[PDB]
């Protein structure tokens, strides 16, 4: 099988750059070489196929070239609706295959995220577990700390953290911190708070409440 | 399996245009 | 021209899973076109299992040749998959994809490319059995609260397989929604929050239900979002 590799595996870009993506293949390909674009929320699409050749309805800022074992596709005037993982693909083997994937995300300025906190639902403590979630909304960059303390006391594996993927307009991620606990532990203590600490923060953000009132 | 036979048909089909 | 792929959500290992694509738009024995299944794997990886076309003849990738089968039923316009000696590793989003067969004299003759897909279907393979979400209410309150704005959510947690779906007031409320990628607890289970923010002021006056769907169990969950007044 002819395996293939894309660079960068990731990068990210401010709208109106121009961005180029390399596709390099184990043999030479002779020119079938493929280009898929891959947004969530839509089906794969096709933007090019046999490296030059656009398919309709795609813009005109995607163009392809290459030759041998090293193709590229270039993004010229890059916009809000660009901004996905692209897929290269050979067409001159028995078994077609795809590269690996260049993510290509937004450049953008900083915004610090808006901190909550939310205890657990009554219902959840009857069911005899406790969840407390930190929400961190709509900030960039994507690196952010997030702390746990209770009592004043760092927690170990107790919590779990995920990550929106990048939103198509506000091209700001937003991230959920949820520490889960057994009802005996959380029934011990008093003072839950989640500490934040971010660029585009001057001082960490703490947010906090005493279970029960 | 055709697919790559193609490959080569292209080459073919070239020397046809030719003439 | 639509490619609606379907099928089960969750397949016991050494099964058979079989998956069926209906081709709304024009005849699958078009003759113009190849019909192919591509798959996803979690980890980004693109894989073509097989290509078919109107007269019989398939293709099929060597590494899964002796255990998949492709085939066309014409008399309903679909596409079926069938994969058999399942195993974890065939965990992964299934496509539908239509190929341009283009002919010797066509300028663009052994030009082969993948110019249209579906939307995807995704199969887990495990032996641990199907287990629907409880929903519990992450309620508004002071502390949740941020300027003029206020945040709500519901908490989607212990099930598996995935995916579970969210929306809100029934699809009205699409501004503001994050609902995040799941996370995969010690249990073995999913667990996953959905959050909104909203006007602080529309508390009181606009009520805020969060609608969970997880077809592998055949769970639908409606609960109501009530703000605590901390
Ligand atoms: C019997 C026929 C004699 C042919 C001998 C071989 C030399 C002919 C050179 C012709 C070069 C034209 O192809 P290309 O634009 O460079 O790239 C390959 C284009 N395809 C991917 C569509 C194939
Ligand atoms: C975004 O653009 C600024 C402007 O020069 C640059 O300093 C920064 O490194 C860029 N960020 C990324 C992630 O490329």
């Known amino acids: 099988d002819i395996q293939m590799t894309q660079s960068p595996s990731s990068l990210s870009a401010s709208v109106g750059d121009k961005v180029t993506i390399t596709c390099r293949a184990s043999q030479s390909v002779t020119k079938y070489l493929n280009w898929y674009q891959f947004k969530t929320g839509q089906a794969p699409r096709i933007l090019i196929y046999g490296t030059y050749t656009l398919l309709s309805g795609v813009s005109p800022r995607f163009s392809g070239a290459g030759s041998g074992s090293l193709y590229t596709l270039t993004i010229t005037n890059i916009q809000p609706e660009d901004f996905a993982t692209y897929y290269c693909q050979q067409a001159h083997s028995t078994p077609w295959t795809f590269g690996q994937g260049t993510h290509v995300a937004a450049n953008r300025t900083v915004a610090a995220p808006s901190v909550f906190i939310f205890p657990p639902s009554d219902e959840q403590l009857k069911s005899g577990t406790a969840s407390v979630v930190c929400l961190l909304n709509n900030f960039y960059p994507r690196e952010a700390k997030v702390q746990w303390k209770v009592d004043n006391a760092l927690q170990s594996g107790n919590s779990q953290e995920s990550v929106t993927e990048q939103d198509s307009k506000d091209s700001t991620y937003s991230l959920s911190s949820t520490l889960t606990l057994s009802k005996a532990d959380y029934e011990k203590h008093k003072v839950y708070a989640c500490e934040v600490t971010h660029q585009g923060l001057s001082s960490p953000v703490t947010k906090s409440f005493n279970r029960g009132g | 399996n055709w697919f790559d036979i193609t490959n080569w048909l292209w080459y073919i089909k070239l020397f046809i245009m030719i003439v | 021209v639509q490619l609606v792929e379907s099928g089960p959500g969750l397949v016991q290992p050494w099964g058979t899973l079989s998956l069926t694509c209906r081709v709304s738009?024009?005849?699958?024995?078009?003759?113009?076109?190849?019909w192919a299944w591509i798959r996803q794997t979690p980890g980004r990886e693109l894989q073509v299992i097989g290509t078919?076309?109107?007269?019989?003849?398939?293709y099929y990738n060597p590494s899964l040749r002796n255990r998949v089968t492709i085939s066309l039923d014409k008399s309903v316009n679909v596409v079926s998959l069938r994969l058999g000696s399942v195993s974890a590793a065939d965990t992964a989003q299934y496509y539908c994809?239509?190929?341009?067969?283009?002919?010797?004299?066509?300028?663009?003759?052994?030009?082969?490319?993948?110019?249209?897909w579906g939307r995807g279907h995704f199969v887990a393979v495990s032996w641990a059995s199907t287990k629907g979400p409880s929903v519990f209410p992450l309620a508004p309150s002071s502390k949740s609260t941020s300027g003029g704005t206020a945040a709500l959510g519901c908490l989607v947690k212990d099930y598996f397989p995935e995916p579970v779906t969210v929306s809100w007031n029934s699809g009205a409320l699409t501004s503001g929604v994050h609902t995040f990628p799941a996370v995969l607890q010690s249990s073995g289970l999913y667990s996953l929050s959905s959050v909104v923010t909203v006007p602080s002021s529309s508390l009181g006056t606009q009520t805020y239900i969060c609608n969970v769907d997880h077809k592998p169990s055949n769970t639908k969950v409606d609960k109501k979002v009530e703000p605590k007044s901390c």
């Open positions: 994809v239509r190929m341009p067969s283009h002919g010797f004299w066509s300028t663009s003759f052994s030009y082969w490319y993948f110019d249209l």
């Open positions: 738009g024009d005849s699958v024995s078009n003759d113009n076109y190849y």
């Open positions: 078919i076309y109107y007269s019989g003849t398939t």
